[PDB]
Design an enzyme around this catalytic site. Structure first.
Site, mmCIF file in Angstrom:
data_model
loop_
_atom_site.group_PDB
_atom_site.id
_atom_site.type_symbol
_atom_site.label_atom_id
_atom_site.label_comp_id
_atom_site.label_asym_id
_atom_site.label_seq_id
_atom_site.Cartn_x
_atom_site.Cartn_y
_atom_site.Cartn_z
ATOM 1 N N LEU A 44 0.812 -1.215 0.000
ATOM 2 C CA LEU A 44 0.000 0.000 0.000
ATOM 3 C C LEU A 44 0.847 1.269 0.000
ATOM 4 C CD1 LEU A 44 -2.837 -1.084 2.461
ATOM 5 C CD2 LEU A 44 -2.863 -1.067 -0.038
ATOM 6 N N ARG A 46 5.040 3.014 1.588
ATOM 7 C CA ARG A 46 6.263 2.974 2.413
ATOM 8 C C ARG A 46 6.403 4.280 3.205
ATOM 9 N N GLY A 47 7.019 4.201 4.403
ATOM 10 C CA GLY A 47 7.292 5.341 5.272
ATOM 11 C C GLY A 47 8.753 5.321 5.717
ATOM 12 N N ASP A 155 2.579 14.184 15.452
ATOM 13 C CA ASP A 155 2.834 14.027 14.016
ATOM 14 C C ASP A 155 1.516 14.140 13.258
ATOM 15 O OD1 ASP A 155 4.941 13.547 11.892
ATOM 16 O OD2 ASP A 155 4.203 11.470 11.750
HETATM 17 O O1 LIG Z 1 0.252 3.477 3.968
HETATM 18 S S1 LIG Z 1 -1.162 3.486 4.211
HETATM 19 O O2 LIG Z 1 -2.000 2.516 3.575
HETATM 20 N N1 LIG Z 1 -1.705 4.932 3.721
HETATM 21 C C1 LIG Z 1 -1.720 6.145 4.549
HETATM 22 C C2 LIG Z 1 -3.086 6.794 4.460
HETATM 23 C C3 LIG Z 1 -3.192 7.829 3.341
HETATM 24 C C4 LIG Z 1 -3.338 9.295 3.800
HETATM 25 C C5 LIG Z 1 -4.327 10.094 2.979
HETATM 26 N N2 LIG Z 1 -4.615 11.416 3.542
HETATM 27 C C6 LIG Z 1 -6.028 11.775 3.381
HETATM 28 C C7 LIG Z 1 -6.387 13.156 3.865
HETATM 29 C C8 LIG Z 1 -6.467 13.460 5.218
HETATM 30 C C9 LIG Z 1 -6.987 14.665 5.659
HETATM 31 C C10 LIG Z 1 -7.437 15.621 4.750
HETATM 32 C C11 LIG Z 1 -8.114 16.809 5.351
HETATM 33 C C12 LIG Z 1 -9.490 16.796 5.605
HETATM 34 C C13 LIG Z 1 -10.109 17.874 6.220
HETATM 35 C C14 LIG Z 1 -9.372 18.977 6.600
HETATM 36 C C15 LIG Z 1 -8.009 19.009 6.356
HETATM 37 C C16 LIG Z 1 -7.384 17.938 5.734
HETATM 38 C C17 LIG Z 1 -7.288 15.323 3.374
HETATM 39 CL CL1 LIG Z 1 -7.713 16.441 2.117
HETATM 40 C C18 LIG Z 1 -6.776 14.117 2.946
HETATM 41 C C19 LIG Z 1 -1.456 3.237 5.943
HETATM 42 C C20 LIG Z 1 -0.439 3.545 6.805
HETATM 43 C C21 LIG Z 1 -0.541 3.226 8.150
HETATM 44 C C22 LIG Z 1 -1.656 2.615 8.642
HETATM 45 C C23 LIG Z 1 -2.734 2.289 7.788
HETATM 46 C C24 LIG Z 1 -3.900 1.612 8.230
HETATM 47 N N3 LIG Z 1 -4.910 1.268 7.427
HETATM 48 C C25 LIG Z 1 -4.810 1.588 6.121
HETATM 49 C C26 LIG Z 1 -3.745 2.245 5.570
HETATM 50 C C27 LIG Z 1 -2.652 2.611 6.403
#
Ligand SMILES: O=S(=O)(NCCCCCNCc1ccc(-c2ccccc2)c(Cl)c1)c1cccc2cnccc12
Length: 330
Positions: A44, A46-47, A155
């Site tokens: 999915l 990397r970090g 964070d």
């Molecule tokens: O690597 S990952 O798959 N992906 C990380 C998640 C993606 C981050 C997307 N950010 C969405 C976001 C946020 C806020 C906003 C936003 C909304 C309102 C106001 C301001 C901003 C807005 Cl506009 C967008 C993962 C990593 C770790 C744990 C995980 C557990 N379960 C699934 C995936 C996981």
């Protein structure tokens, strides 16, 4: 002598009142589950400190997420596990399901609940004013909860906020940098992404608290309502404070430094200069105006303060007029 001490305004002593085992994560003994219960499906992301996969629990056919940790000190892994366990079931907190080890790599993996997080590129073009208020409120519920439980996330940023837009569902993830708040404790300032670092971190003021999260949140809000990501775009940690100073002004910065008797790195004396406090109106334009309200600007102003003590608490933020419509629904 040195810097003036500081205490959280709220939830100051919540940890002192808990049994030691709650916060004394070095004493935590990890129960490892069985790696063979999970089969990885696809990568999915990397970090800095992990690779994240979708997987299946073959015992019960549940979709899950596995976060395989890159090498980190045992105590930092224990800290994240303890915090996830303490927060489990709290509003909008990611659920830790299980903890496993690869018995050839010796690598530890955290197993989470699956959240159907929504296309990053896509959803951004559709966010209404209401949507931003709603999701901000959902983040505040997670922050009030974790703060009330004696934990700083440290964070907060868009990458750490999962949204399942279809289900109007939000989860705060990536508790790997979170820490327990203890009055008097001097914390490591080398946390958070550059763009989201609070002034306290940038000036090396160690006796910080939950209010760090509120600065980061303000940075997010600014970027969303103004359609400017990042809002404070520094070239490095020094220039990051300069970018803040060009908006908040230098008078208030130097007032903060004076109040806490902070010893400013001499590097800064050259580069901060003299800047007026800018009105938020300079970021408003025809494209973003639908997101920007008197209420939004008042709220934002009350998050983005140098002085950590003057920032809204999570619970205060939730009572702001910006949220009145959202509150009336629920
Ligand atoms: O690597 S990952 O798959 N992906 C990380 C998640 C993606 C981050 C997307 N950010 C969405 C976001 C946020 C806020 C906003 C936003 C909304 C309102 C106001 C301001 C901003 C807005 Cl506009 C967008 C993962 C990593 C770790 C744990 C995980 C557990 N379960 C699934 C995936 C996981």
């Amino acid at each position: 002598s040195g810097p003036v001490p500081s205490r959280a305004r709220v939830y100051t002593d919540v940890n002192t009142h808990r049994p030691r085992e709650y916060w004394d994560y070095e004493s935590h003994v990890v129960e490892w589950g069985n790696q063979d219960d999970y089969q990885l499906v696809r990568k999915l992301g990397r970090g800095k400190y992990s690779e994240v996969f979708e997987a299946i629990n073959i015992t019960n056919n549940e979709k899950v997420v596995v976060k395989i940790l890159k090498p980190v000190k045992k105590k930092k892994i224990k800290r994240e596990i303890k915090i996830l366990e303490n927060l489990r079931g709290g509003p909008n907190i990611i659920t830790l399901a299980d903890i496993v080890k690869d018995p050839v790599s010796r690598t530890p993996a955290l197993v989470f609940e699956h959240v159907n997080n929504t296309d990053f590129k896509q959803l951004y073009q559709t966010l209404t004013d209401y949507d931003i208020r709603f999701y901000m409120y959902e983040i505040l519920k997670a922050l009030d909860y974790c703060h009330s439980m004696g934990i700083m996330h440290r964070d907060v940023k868009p990458h750490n906020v999962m949204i399942d837009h279809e289900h109007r569902k939000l989860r705060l993830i990536d508790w790997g940098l979170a820490e327990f708040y203890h009055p008097g404790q001097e914390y490591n300032v080398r946390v958070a992404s550059r763009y989201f670092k609070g002034p306290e971190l940038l000036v090396d003021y160690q006796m910080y608290d939950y209010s760090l999260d509120m600065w980061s949140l303000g940075c997010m809000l600014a970027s969303m309502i103004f359609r400017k990501e990042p809002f404070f775009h520094g070239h490095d940690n020094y220039d990051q404070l300069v970018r803040i100073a060009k908006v908040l002004g230098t008078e208030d910065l130097y007032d903060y430094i004076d109040k806490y008797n902070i010893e400013l790195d001499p590097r800064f004396n050259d580069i901060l200069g003299r800047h007026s406090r800018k009105r938020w109106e300079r970021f408003v334009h025809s494209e973003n105006q639908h997101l920007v309200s008197p209420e939004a600007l008042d709220f934002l102003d009350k998050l983005l303060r140098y002085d950590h003590q003057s920032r809204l608490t999570a619970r205060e933020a939730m009572e702001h007029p910006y949220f009145y419509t959202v509150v009336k629904d629920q």
